[PDB]
Symmetry: C2
Subunit: 180 residues, 2 copies
Protein backbone atom coordinates (compact mmCIF):
# COMPACT_ATOMS: atom_id res chain seq x y z
CA UNK A 1 0.00 0.00 0.00
CA UNK A 2 1.13 3.67 -0.51
CA UNK A 3 3.50 4.47 2.43
CA UNK A 4 6.38 6.63 1.26
CA UNK A 5 4.99 10.17 1.46
CA UNK A 6 5.86 10.74 -2.22
CA UNK A 7 3.58 7.75 -2.94
CA UNK A 8 0.64 9.13 -0.88
CA UNK A 9 1.22 12.47 -2.76
CA UNK A 10 1.13 10.67 -6.17
CA UNK A 11 -1.82 8.62 -4.78
CA UNK A 12 -3.96 11.60 -3.63
CA UNK A 13 -3.40 13.34 -7.08
CA UNK A 14 -4.59 10.14 -8.95
CA UNK A 15 -7.69 10.10 -6.61
CA UNK A 16 -8.37 13.82 -7.39
CA UNK A 17 -8.53 13.09 -11.16
CA UNK A 18 -10.62 9.84 -10.55
CA UNK A 19 -13.23 11.80 -8.48
CA UNK A 20 -13.04 14.80 -10.92
CA UNK A 21 -13.79 12.61 -14.05
CA UNK A 22 -16.07 10.20 -12.03
CA UNK A 23 -17.01 6.45 -12.30
CA UNK A 24 -17.35 6.83 -16.12
CA UNK A 25 -13.85 8.20 -17.00
CA UNK A 26 -12.11 9.49 -20.19
CA UNK A 27 -14.56 7.51 -22.42
CA UNK A 28 -17.35 9.76 -21.01
CA UNK A 29 -15.28 12.92 -21.78
CA UNK A 30 -14.47 11.59 -25.32
CA UNK A 31 -18.29 11.14 -25.83
CA UNK A 32 -18.85 14.76 -24.62
CA UNK A 33 -16.38 15.78 -27.44
CA UNK A 34 -18.17 13.51 -30.02
CA UNK A 35 -21.48 15.25 -29.11
CA UNK A 36 -19.75 18.62 -29.92
CA UNK A 37 -18.60 17.34 -33.35
CA UNK A 38 -22.35 16.51 -33.77
CA UNK A 39 -23.41 20.08 -32.79
CA UNK A 40 -20.67 21.40 -35.21
CA UNK A 41 -21.89 19.41 -38.29
CA UNK A 42 -25.59 20.39 -37.71
CA UNK A 43 -24.63 24.13 -37.44
CA UNK A 44 -22.42 23.72 -40.59
CA UNK A 45 -25.52 22.05 -42.18
CA UNK A 46 -27.82 25.00 -41.14
CA UNK A 47 -25.21 27.61 -42.34
CA UNK A 48 -24.99 25.94 -45.83
CA UNK A 49 -28.78 25.34 -46.01
CA UNK A 50 -28.94 29.20 -45.73
CA UNK A 51 -26.23 29.91 -48.43
CA UNK A 52 -28.19 27.49 -50.71
CA UNK A 53 -31.47 29.44 -50.11
CA UNK A 54 -29.65 32.79 -50.88
CA UNK A 55 -28.20 31.32 -54.14
CA UNK A 56 -31.59 29.85 -55.21
CA UNK A 57 -33.22 33.31 -54.61
CA UNK A 58 -30.45 35.12 -56.58
CA UNK A 59 -30.94 32.68 -59.51
CA UNK A 60 -34.77 33.16 -59.26
CA UNK A 61 -34.38 37.03 -59.26
CA UNK A 62 -31.82 36.85 -62.19
CA UNK A 63 -34.99 36.25 -64.37
CA UNK A 64 -35.32 40.12 -64.23
CA UNK A 65 -31.77 41.12 -63.09
CA UNK A 66 -31.83 44.99 -63.65
CA UNK A 67 -35.40 45.36 -62.13
CA UNK A 68 -34.26 43.47 -58.95
CA UNK A 69 -30.99 45.53 -58.88
CA UNK A 70 -30.93 46.32 -55.08
CA UNK A 71 -32.56 43.02 -53.92
CA UNK A 72 -29.69 40.94 -55.51
CA UNK A 73 -27.15 43.20 -53.66
CA UNK A 74 -28.85 42.75 -50.21
CA UNK A 75 -28.50 38.96 -50.76
CA UNK A 76 -24.96 39.58 -52.20
CA UNK A 77 -24.20 41.57 -48.97
CA UNK A 78 -26.10 38.99 -46.82
CA UNK A 79 -23.84 36.12 -48.16
CA UNK A 80 -20.59 38.16 -47.65
CA UNK A 81 -21.48 39.02 -43.99
CA UNK A 82 -22.88 35.46 -43.55
CA UNK A 83 -19.30 34.44 -44.64
CA UNK A 84 -18.65 33.50 -40.97
CA UNK A 85 -16.66 30.36 -41.97
CA UNK A 86 -13.71 31.69 -39.84
CA UNK A 87 -16.01 31.25 -36.77
CA UNK A 88 -16.94 27.70 -37.95
CA UNK A 89 -13.12 27.16 -38.38
CA UNK A 90 -12.52 28.52 -34.84
CA UNK A 91 -15.15 26.03 -33.44
CA UNK A 92 -13.48 23.12 -35.36
CA UNK A 93 -10.13 24.42 -33.93
CA UNK A 94 -11.52 24.51 -30.34
CA UNK A 95 -13.02 20.98 -30.70
CA UNK A 96 -9.79 19.48 -32.19
CA UNK A 97 -7.80 21.02 -29.25
CA UNK A 98 -10.31 19.55 -26.69
CA UNK A 99 -10.19 16.01 -28.14
CA UNK A 100 -6.33 16.40 -28.08
CA UNK A 101 -6.21 17.30 -24.32
CA UNK A 102 -8.56 14.37 -23.34
CA UNK A 103 -6.13 11.94 -25.13
CA UNK A 104 -3.10 13.57 -23.39
CA UNK A 105 -4.95 13.43 -20.01
CA UNK A 106 -5.95 9.71 -20.46
CA UNK A 107 -2.38 8.69 -21.62
CA UNK A 108 -0.76 10.75 -18.76
CA UNK A 109 -3.28 9.51 -16.14
CA UNK A 110 -2.50 5.84 -17.00
CA UNK A 111 1.26 6.62 -17.10
CA UNK A 112 0.87 7.96 -13.50
CA UNK A 113 -1.28 5.05 -12.12
CA UNK A 114 1.14 2.49 -13.75
CA UNK A 115 4.17 4.43 -12.32
CA UNK A 116 3.00 4.58 -8.64
CA UNK A 117 2.56 0.77 -8.75
CA UNK A 118 6.00 0.07 -10.30
CA UNK A 119 7.15 2.49 -7.51
CA UNK A 120 5.60 0.26 -4.77
CA UNK A 121 7.00 -2.98 -6.37
CA UNK A 122 10.51 -1.36 -6.40
CA UNK A 123 10.25 -0.64 -2.59
CA UNK A 124 8.79 -4.13 -1.75
CA UNK A 125 11.94 -5.52 -3.38
CA UNK A 126 14.35 -3.36 -1.23
CA UNK A 127 16.05 -2.35 -4.53
CA UNK A 128 16.45 1.17 -3.01
CA UNK A 129 18.87 3.50 -4.84
CA UNK A 130 15.82 5.85 -4.80
CA UNK A 131 14.55 3.95 -7.95
CA UNK A 132 11.38 3.45 -5.76
CA UNK A 133 11.01 7.28 -5.17
CA UNK A 134 12.00 8.08 -8.84
CA UNK A 135 8.91 6.12 -10.07
CA UNK A 136 6.78 7.76 -7.32
CA UNK A 137 7.93 11.28 -8.50
CA UNK A 138 7.33 10.52 -12.24
CA UNK A 139 3.83 9.39 -11.07
CA UNK A 140 2.99 12.69 -9.27
CA UNK A 141 4.23 14.86 -12.20
CA UNK A 142 2.27 12.72 -14.72
CA UNK A 143 -0.90 13.36 -12.55
CA UNK A 144 -0.09 17.15 -12.51
CA UNK A 145 0.09 16.93 -16.39
CA UNK A 146 -3.23 14.97 -16.65
CA UNK A 147 -4.79 17.76 -14.48
CA UNK A 148 -3.15 20.44 -16.78
CA UNK A 149 -4.75 18.75 -19.88
CA UNK A 150 -8.19 18.48 -18.09
CA UNK A 151 -7.80 22.25 -17.36
CA UNK A 152 -7.14 23.24 -21.05
CA UNK A 153 -9.95 20.84 -22.08
CA UNK A 154 -12.51 22.63 -19.87
CA UNK A 155 -11.38 26.07 -21.33
CA UNK A 156 -11.67 24.97 -24.99
CA UNK A 157 -14.98 23.07 -24.51
CA UNK A 158 -16.43 26.31 -23.01
CA UNK A 159 -15.09 28.48 -25.91
CA UNK A 160 -16.73 25.93 -28.29
CA UNK A 161 -20.20 26.05 -26.59
CA UNK A 162 -19.82 29.88 -26.58
CA UNK A 163 -18.65 30.38 -30.24
CA UNK A 164 -21.33 27.88 -31.41
CA UNK A 165 -24.20 29.73 -29.60
CA UNK A 166 -23.09 33.02 -31.29
CA UNK A 167 -22.99 31.64 -34.90
CA UNK A 168 -26.20 29.55 -34.35
CA UNK A 169 -27.99 32.88 -33.62
CA UNK A 170 -26.39 34.67 -36.65
CA UNK A 171 -27.57 31.71 -38.86
CA UNK A 172 -31.17 31.52 -37.39
CA UNK A 173 -31.38 35.35 -38.00
CA UNK A 174 -30.22 35.14 -41.68
CA UNK A 175 -32.64 32.15 -42.12
CA UNK A 176 -35.73 34.08 -40.83
CA UNK A 177 -34.84 37.13 -43.03
CA UNK A 178 -35.28 34.71 -46.03
CA UNK A 179 -38.45 32.76 -44.84
CA UNK A 180 -40.33 36.07 -45.57
CA UNK B 1 -31.01 27.55 -68.47
CA UNK B 2 -31.65 29.05 -64.95
CA UNK B 3 -30.64 25.45 -63.93
CA UNK B 4 -27.55 23.23 -64.62
CA UNK B 5 -27.51 23.46 -68.52
CA UNK B 6 -23.76 23.45 -69.45
CA UNK B 7 -22.21 19.94 -69.93
CA UNK B 8 -19.71 20.50 -66.99
CA UNK B 9 -22.64 21.89 -64.82
CA UNK B 10 -24.83 18.81 -65.63
CA UNK B 11 -21.85 16.50 -64.76
CA UNK B 12 -21.08 18.47 -61.52
CA UNK B 13 -24.85 18.33 -60.77
CA UNK B 14 -25.07 14.50 -61.35
CA UNK B 15 -21.95 13.89 -59.11
CA UNK B 16 -23.40 15.95 -56.17
CA UNK B 17 -26.84 14.30 -56.62
CA UNK B 18 -25.17 10.82 -56.65
CA UNK B 19 -23.57 11.62 -53.22
CA UNK B 20 -26.99 12.78 -51.83
CA UNK B 21 -28.62 9.46 -52.99
CA UNK B 22 -25.58 7.32 -51.97
CA UNK B 23 -25.39 8.47 -48.26
CA UNK B 24 -29.11 9.51 -47.91
CA UNK B 25 -30.69 12.58 -46.17
CA UNK B 26 -28.65 13.70 -43.07
CA UNK B 27 -26.06 11.15 -44.36
CA UNK B 28 -22.93 13.12 -43.32
CA UNK B 29 -24.21 13.93 -39.79
CA UNK B 30 -25.06 10.17 -39.39
CA UNK B 31 -21.70 8.93 -40.83
CA UNK B 32 -19.77 11.32 -38.47
CA UNK B 33 -21.85 9.98 -35.49
CA UNK B 34 -20.94 6.30 -36.48
CA UNK B 35 -17.07 6.81 -36.36
CA UNK B 36 -17.43 8.95 -33.22
CA UNK B 37 -19.41 6.03 -31.69
CA UNK B 38 -16.63 3.63 -32.89
CA UNK B 39 -14.01 5.94 -31.26
CA UNK B 40 -16.16 5.66 -28.04
CA UNK B 41 -15.94 1.82 -28.23
CA UNK B 42 -12.15 2.01 -28.89
CA UNK B 43 -11.62 4.09 -25.67
CA UNK B 44 -13.72 1.54 -23.68
CA UNK B 45 -11.42 -1.28 -24.90
CA UNK B 46 -8.38 0.97 -24.10
CA UNK B 47 -9.86 1.50 -20.59
CA UNK B 48 -10.37 -2.31 -20.11
CA UNK B 49 -6.76 -2.84 -21.33
CA UNK B 50 -5.40 -0.41 -18.66
CA UNK B 51 -7.75 -1.94 -15.96
CA UNK B 52 -6.16 -5.40 -16.78
CA UNK B 53 -2.58 -3.94 -16.48
CA UNK B 54 -3.73 -2.59 -13.06
CA UNK B 55 -5.28 -6.03 -12.13
CA UNK B 56 -1.82 -7.55 -13.00
CA UNK B 57 0.21 -4.92 -11.05
CA UNK B 58 -2.03 -5.45 -7.95
CA UNK B 59 -1.50 -9.27 -8.25
CA UNK B 60 2.31 -8.71 -8.25
CA UNK B 61 2.07 -6.48 -5.06
CA UNK B 62 -0.24 -9.16 -3.52
CA UNK B 63 2.26 -12.05 -4.29
CA UNK B 64 5.27 -9.84 -3.24
CA UNK B 65 4.36 -10.37 0.48
CA UNK B 66 5.99 -13.84 -0.20
CA UNK B 67 8.61 -13.08 -2.96
CA UNK B 68 10.49 -16.47 -2.50
CA UNK B 69 7.56 -18.97 -2.88
CA UNK B 70 5.75 -16.85 -5.54
CA UNK B 71 8.91 -15.84 -7.56
CA UNK B 72 7.86 -17.95 -10.66
CA UNK B 73 4.16 -16.85 -10.47
CA UNK B 74 5.47 -13.17 -10.29
CA UNK B 75 7.92 -13.64 -13.29
CA UNK B 76 4.88 -15.01 -15.27
CA UNK B 77 3.07 -11.67 -14.54
CA UNK B 78 6.16 -9.57 -15.48
CA UNK B 79 5.77 -11.40 -18.87
CA UNK B 80 1.97 -11.36 -19.47
CA UNK B 81 2.35 -7.54 -18.84
CA UNK B 82 5.26 -6.82 -21.19
CA UNK B 83 4.17 -9.67 -23.51
CA UNK B 84 1.18 -7.57 -24.56
CA UNK B 85 1.87 -5.18 -27.49
CA UNK B 86 -1.98 -5.09 -27.41
CA UNK B 87 -0.74 -1.48 -27.11
CA UNK B 88 0.60 -2.19 -30.69
CA UNK B 89 -2.98 -2.91 -31.97
CA UNK B 90 -4.71 -0.14 -29.91
CA UNK B 91 -2.71 2.79 -31.44
CA UNK B 92 -3.04 1.04 -34.86
CA UNK B 93 -6.87 1.16 -34.26
CA UNK B 94 -6.60 4.76 -32.93
CA UNK B 95 -4.78 5.62 -36.23
CA UNK B 96 -7.45 3.91 -38.39
CA UNK B 97 -10.30 5.81 -36.60
CA UNK B 98 -8.55 9.25 -36.75
CA UNK B 99 -8.09 8.69 -40.54
CA UNK B 100 -11.81 7.66 -40.89
CA UNK B 101 -12.86 10.76 -38.81
CA UNK B 102 -10.67 13.06 -41.00
CA UNK B 103 -11.94 11.34 -44.20
CA UNK B 104 -15.69 11.71 -43.40
CA UNK B 105 -15.13 15.35 -42.19
CA UNK B 106 -13.33 16.14 -45.51
CA UNK B 107 -16.12 14.38 -47.47
CA UNK B 108 -18.74 16.80 -45.97
CA UNK B 109 -16.50 19.93 -46.31
CA UNK B 110 -15.89 19.07 -50.02
CA UNK B 111 -19.64 18.30 -50.63
CA UNK B 112 -20.59 21.74 -49.18
CA UNK B 113 -17.92 23.41 -51.46
CA UNK B 114 -19.11 21.43 -54.56
CA UNK B 115 -22.81 22.60 -54.20
CA UNK B 116 -21.62 26.13 -53.29
CA UNK B 117 -19.41 26.32 -56.47
CA UNK B 118 -22.11 24.79 -58.75
CA UNK B 119 -24.66 27.49 -57.88
CA UNK B 120 -22.00 30.34 -58.15
CA UNK B 121 -20.93 29.06 -61.64
CA UNK B 122 -24.62 29.03 -62.79
CA UNK B 123 -25.13 32.56 -61.33
CA UNK B 124 -21.89 33.69 -63.13
CA UNK B 125 -23.22 31.99 -66.33
CA UNK B 126 -26.55 33.89 -66.01
CA UNK B 127 -24.50 37.17 -65.98
CA UNK B 128 -23.27 36.18 -69.54
CA UNK B 129 -20.15 38.46 -69.23
CA UNK B 130 -18.07 36.02 -67.01
CA UNK B 131 -18.00 32.61 -68.87
CA UNK B 132 -14.27 31.91 -68.07
CA UNK B 133 -15.18 32.24 -64.31
CA UNK B 134 -18.45 30.21 -64.82
CA UNK B 135 -16.15 27.38 -66.17
CA UNK B 136 -13.59 27.29 -63.27
CA UNK B 137 -16.56 27.05 -60.81
CA UNK B 138 -18.41 24.23 -62.72
CA UNK B 139 -14.95 22.50 -62.82
CA UNK B 140 -14.10 23.25 -59.12
CA UNK B 141 -17.63 21.96 -58.29
CA UNK B 142 -16.96 18.66 -60.20
CA UNK B 143 -13.51 18.03 -58.61
CA UNK B 144 -14.74 18.76 -55.02
CA UNK B 145 -17.66 16.33 -55.71
CA UNK B 146 -15.19 13.63 -56.93
CA UNK B 147 -12.90 14.45 -53.92
CA UNK B 148 -15.98 13.90 -51.69
CA UNK B 149 -16.60 10.40 -53.15
CA UNK B 150 -12.92 9.48 -52.78
CA UNK B 151 -13.17 10.48 -49.07
CA UNK B 152 -16.31 8.25 -48.70
CA UNK B 153 -14.30 5.34 -50.25
CA UNK B 154 -11.38 5.97 -47.81
CA UNK B 155 -13.84 6.28 -44.83
CA UNK B 156 -15.41 2.80 -45.46
CA UNK B 157 -11.98 1.03 -45.93
CA UNK B 158 -10.57 2.58 -42.72
CA UNK B 159 -13.84 1.94 -40.79
CA UNK B 160 -13.84 -1.67 -42.10
CA UNK B 161 -10.18 -2.15 -41.02
CA UNK B 162 -10.96 -0.50 -37.61
CA UNK B 163 -13.83 -3.04 -36.99
CA UNK B 164 -11.59 -6.04 -37.88
CA UNK B 165 -8.91 -4.75 -35.47
CA UNK B 166 -11.66 -3.98 -32.87
CA UNK B 167 -12.97 -7.62 -32.89
CA UNK B 168 -9.47 -9.21 -32.41
CA UNK B 169 -8.20 -7.05 -29.44
CA UNK B 170 -11.59 -7.55 -27.68
CA UNK B 171 -10.97 -11.35 -27.49
CA UNK B 172 -7.23 -10.76 -26.69
CA UNK B 173 -8.11 -8.36 -23.78
CA UNK B 174 -11.11 -10.58 -22.74
CA UNK B 175 -8.64 -13.54 -22.57
CA UNK B 176 -6.15 -11.47 -20.48
CA UNK B 177 -8.96 -10.78 -17.88
CA UNK B 178 -9.90 -14.55 -17.87
CA UNK B 179 -6.16 -15.53 -17.49
CA UNK B 180 -5.98 -13.55 -14.18
CA UNK B 181 -8.84 -15.88 -12.95
Amino acid sequence: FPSTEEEKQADKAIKDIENLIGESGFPELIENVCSLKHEYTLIRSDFYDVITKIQNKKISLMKNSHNNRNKIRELVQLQNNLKIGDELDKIMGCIDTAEQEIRSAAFFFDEAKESLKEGIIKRLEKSKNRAASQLSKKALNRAEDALRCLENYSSKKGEAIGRRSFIKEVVEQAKNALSK
